[PDB]
Amino acid sequence: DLPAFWTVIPAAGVGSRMRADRPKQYLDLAGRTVIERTLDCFLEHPMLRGLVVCLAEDDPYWPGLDCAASRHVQRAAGGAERAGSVLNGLLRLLELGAQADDWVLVHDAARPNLTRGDLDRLLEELAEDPVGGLLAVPARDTLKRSDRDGRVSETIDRSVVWLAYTPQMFRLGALHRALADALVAGVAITDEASAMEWAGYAPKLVEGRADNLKITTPEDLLRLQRSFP
Amino acid sequence: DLPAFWTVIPAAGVGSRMRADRPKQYLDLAGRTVIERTLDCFLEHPMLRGLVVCLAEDDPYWPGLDCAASRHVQRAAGGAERAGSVLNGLLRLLELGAQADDWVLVHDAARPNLTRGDLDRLLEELAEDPVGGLLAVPARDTLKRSDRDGRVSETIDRSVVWLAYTPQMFRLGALHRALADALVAGVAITDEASAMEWAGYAPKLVEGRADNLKITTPEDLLRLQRSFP
Numbered sequence A, B: 001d002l003p004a005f006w007t008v009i010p011a012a013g014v015g016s017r018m019r020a021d022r023p024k025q026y027l028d029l030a031g032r033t034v035i036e037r038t039l040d041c042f043l044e045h046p047m048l049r050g051l052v053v054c055l056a057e058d059d060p061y062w063p064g065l066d067c068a069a070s071r072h073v074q075r076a077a078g079g080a081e082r083a084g085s086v087l088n089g090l091l092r093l094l095e096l097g098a099q100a101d102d103w104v105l106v107h108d109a110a111r112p113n114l115t116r117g118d119l120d121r122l123l124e125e126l127a128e129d130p131v132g133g134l135l136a137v138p139a140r141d142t143l144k145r146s147d148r149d150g151r152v153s154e155t156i157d158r159s160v161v162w163l164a165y166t167p168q169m170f171r172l173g174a175l176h177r178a179l180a181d182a183l184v185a186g187v188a189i190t191d192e193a194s195a196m197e198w199a200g201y202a203p204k205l206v207e208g209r210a211d212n213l214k215i216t217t218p219e220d221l222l223r224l225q226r227s228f229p
């Protein structure tokens, strides 16, 4: 019995001006934009209560997509940083009838290769967790720590090192307090787990697939061109 | 004035039997095998004294390549592990007239995107180094350390964490002693830097390009299909 969950897709930071170097979320991935394929990983799930995309109010690419005329996709105003945009998504969820104890999933707009297995695996393993968790994969490259002189001080034991992926799964109320307080404190928030970690909580690690990659360079598109359907 | 250097390409571990899931070094990369493109990064360098490929004596793919009939490529017998094959490559270099103080470069057979810039940058920055070093790139993914309960114990400060790449550049005599003694000691050697680290030396880090990737899955080929010429 998988739990019910809301979904927040932070996708702001896009300028008002179309550019030849398009935002990675609007690149073409086998006939569709990256963010459209990212939304498909969630929109069809029976336990989905509602999905909210965080966007700049002057985003020139979004009104061209068919998901902009979709009742299954809600929109929230972007913030100054990613954490602020996630915060506005949490406020938008509260307007749609979300409760403080509802599960919320935050997922990168440029991670379109999220499989149904990883999603349900994350949902079934955290459904009874006291704080939540996130998808992650073990580090497979040799890690080396540097001293101040640029020389190797040690080879890090990567058997305990995991790469942080998305989605990340936390309770709406707790994440709301953690994100808002950490922004007031001046914390260098990266993901939602870092805000929960600063607040004292230890998120659970849920192993996911390694090909759930984030599109950071247009060369990373080439890895996923054969991944659909 | 770049220093003179020998090159060892460990490429053993290949079985005697051709298989449909070919060894990654023999996959096609825009009309040529991965290992052929890897050798091209070195064979044309004016400071190259000699290149040695470590191969199993029953390798069914190598005799089909034109580099098997090339005077510019020498061959050494593979060992039981990668470190042993590297060791036999060092012995093969000594037969070709190498000296104990000569620079040796060890590079992965499945890293064909090594640019001339990274190679010379590694050579010019380590030419006067007391031990040597290796190419590396800074970690750009969020790193999380796991406790014994599978929960995040800390987010690792990745400002001091580097991913270890190749080539790696060490003196022939020192690497020979470090590799041989560490194998006798029972050390879990990964790369040459780990053997030098166990021997007490601190290798220098030389920043290289991030697209000098190792081909571990046939999906990684897709990243490099547009990288040549």
Ligand SMILES: CN1Cc2cccnc2C1=O
Pocket (backbone or CB within 6 Å): A010, A011, A012, A013, A054, A078, A079, A080, A081, A082, A083, A085, A086
């Ligand atoms: C994914 N991102 C990046 C960013 C920068 C600034 C404001 N919002 C955002 C957001 O949602």
Ligand SMILES: CN1Cc2cccnc2C1=O
Pocket (backbone or CB within 6 Å): B010, B011, B012, B013, B054, B078, B079, B080, B081, B082, B083, B085, B086
């Ligand atoms: C690159 N590799 C892997 C391996 C396994 C066993 C023996 N030699 C080798 C070698 O050179």
